[PDB]
Design a protein around this ligand. Structure first.
Ligand code: C0W
Ligand code: ZN
Ligand code: ZN
Length: 218
């Protein structure tokens, strides 16, 4: 698949299909993934990046390439890899969608607040692009949500879902290891036919990444 990088190599986008790309940024080294959705009404991101500098660079790269503005971002939980660029979003007039709990936790941790507009299931449409957000329960954090693209059967698992390269659950200080398996099971029950799964860190995979996360929780 096509992969495009910035002048420094700290930001990369990789095409999943005509209108869906994965963005990956390196924070001081630790890579993090989100999505870029190229819609008829603008670019929509799933997740920002580790900090304002990387978020600015990401936005500038995709706006130049796709020749449209970033209008919205979905924030999937309140840690820095997801929300670290919220100041940039708000000052540029980019809408930052989140659940109410993710917004409360952002404020509690001293970040600017996202909108708090997403419910347990929310269905959004941006141009012709359909996006569903789902809160499956506690796991990696208390507020983690997943994002589903029903027109492609692509699931953005975020940090709820570990990549194949992950050999342990990572930092579990904010995690609920006795609920995380049930939360993964709720994803598997809701989305019974999955084409690709994008983890918060590491390589894109399929439903097997959810099964891998279940095994790491044993
Ligand atoms: O492993 C991950 O996907 C992430 S986002 C870990 C993390 C980033 S700040 C932080 C603070 C407390 C516990 C975990 C973490
Ligand atoms: Zn996290
Ligand atoms: Zn993460």
């Amino acid at each position: 698949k096509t992969v495009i990088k910035n002048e420094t190599g700290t930001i990369s986008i990789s095409q999943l299909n005509k209108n869906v790309w994965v963005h990956t940024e390196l924070g001081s080294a630790v890579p993090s993934n989100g999505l870029v959705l190229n819609t008829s009404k603008g670019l929509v991101l799933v997740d920002s990046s580790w900090d304002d500098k990387l978020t600015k660079e990401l936005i500038e790269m995709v706006e130049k390439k796709f020749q449209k503005r970033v209008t919205d971002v979905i924030i999937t939980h309140a840690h820095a890899d997801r929300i670290g660029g919220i100041k940039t979003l708000k000052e540029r007039g980019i809408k930052a969608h989140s659940t109410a709990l993710t917004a409360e936790l952002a404020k509690k941790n001293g970040y600017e607040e996202p909108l708090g507009d997403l419910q347990t299931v929310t269905n959004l449409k941006f141009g012709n692009m359909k996006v569903e957000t789902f809160y499956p329960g506690k796991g990696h954090t208390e507020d983690n949500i997943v994002v589903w693209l029903p027109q492609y059967n692509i699931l953005v698992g975020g940090c709820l879902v570990k990549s194949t390269s992950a050999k342990d659950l990572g930092n579990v200080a904010d995690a609920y290891v006795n609920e995380w398996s049930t939360s993964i099971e709720n994803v598997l029950k809701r989305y019974r036919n999955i084409n690709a799964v994008v983890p918060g860190h590491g390589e894109v995979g399929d439903k097997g990444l959810l099964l891998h996360t279940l095994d790491l929780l044993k």
